[PDB]
Amino acid sequence: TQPLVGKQILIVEDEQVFRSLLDSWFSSLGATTVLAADGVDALELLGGFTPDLMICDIAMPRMNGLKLLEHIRNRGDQTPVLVISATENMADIAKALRLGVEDVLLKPVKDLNRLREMVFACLYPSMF
Amino acid sequence: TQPLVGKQILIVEDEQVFRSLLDSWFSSLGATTVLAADGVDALELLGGFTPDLMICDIAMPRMNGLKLLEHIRNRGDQTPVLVISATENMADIAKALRLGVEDVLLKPVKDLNRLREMVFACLYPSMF
Ligand code: BEF
Ligand code: BEF
Ligand SMILES: [Mg+2]
Numbered sequence: 001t002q003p004l005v006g007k008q009i010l011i012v013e014d015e016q017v018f019r020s021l022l023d024s025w026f027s028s029l030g031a032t033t034v035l036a037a038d039g040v041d042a043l044e045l046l047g048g049f050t051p052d053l054m055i056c057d058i059a060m061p062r063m064n065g066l067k068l069l070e071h072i073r074n075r076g077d078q079t080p081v082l083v084i085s086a087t088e089n090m091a092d093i094a095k096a097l098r099l100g101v102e103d104v105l106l107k108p109v110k111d112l113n114r115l116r117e118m119v120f121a122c123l124y125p126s127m128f
Numbered sequence: 129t130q131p132l133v134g135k136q137i138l139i140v141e142d143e144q145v146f147r148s149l150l151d152s153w154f155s156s157l158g159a160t161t162v163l164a165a166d167g168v169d170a171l172e173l174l175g176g177f178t179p180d181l182m183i184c185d186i187a188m189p190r191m192n193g194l195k196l197l198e199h200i201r202n203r204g205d206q207t208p209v210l211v212i213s214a215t216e217n218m219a220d221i222a223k224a225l226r227l228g229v230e231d232v233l234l235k236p237v238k239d240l241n242r243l244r245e246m247v248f249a250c251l252y253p254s255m256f
């Protein structure tokens with residue numbers, strides 16, 4: 001019952017309650033998690049490690065997730081990214097898809113069984 | 129009511145429930161938190177960033193906190209460290225104090241007001 005053993009997930013999210021929920025879910029599935037409350041902090045961290053997947057919020061205090069994405073994509077980083085956001089802004093969702101994220105999911109998350117499918121697909125893809 | 133604004137705290141702890149509690153406490157005090165479920169993961173992360181304080185567990189699955197400490201101290205890292213552990217092993221507590229940790233606190237944590245004092249003292253010391 002641990003399909004994600006051996007996979008490392010970076011979670012970037014400013015609301016501590018949701019940070020805890022994602023940690024609990026992905027840890028229970030066997031992944032080792034790294035959590036960053038802040039986009040600037042996540043940017044610096046990515047300089048020294050290579051997560052298998054990053055789960056990323058959009059609205060965050062100091063630097064939002066779209067700017068985070070641009071910085072790491074501009075430097076050649078092709079880490080798979082799943083965005084989980086409350087945004088309804090279609091331009092901001094399009095910006096993330098242009099930056100090569102696998103999908104953008106809307107908060108609150110309700111089909112946890114679906115989230116599971118998509119995260120596994122992100123970690124063990126069949127095509128590019 | 130945010131005495132830790134501007135300070136970054138790394139939390140290394142394998143139990144997700146306690147990981148969440150520390151995140152909630154330190155975030156509410158204004159610190160930005162980075163959480164690692166795993167000691168090997170924390171070691172790699174420290175190669176690319178410089179937290180103001182690390183809060184560290186001892187018993188963790190793959191690599192315990194004492195080995196983590198030795199590795200980063202052996203490489204010249206003098207990040208302040210606070211150990212929060214359930215260990216009753218006096219030799220293991222002594223090992224951490226020999227590796228230069230500021231203190232070793234026993235789980236479960238009950239004087240949250242005291243934890244606050246000691247973390248601030250670690251971040252804003254008066255002497256060496
Ligand atoms: F703050 Be996020 F965009 F949900
Ligand atoms: F697992 Be720890 F030493 F509390
Ligand atoms: Mg947010």
Ligand SMILES: [Mg+2]
Nearest residue numbers: 142185187188
């Ligand atoms: Mg432990």
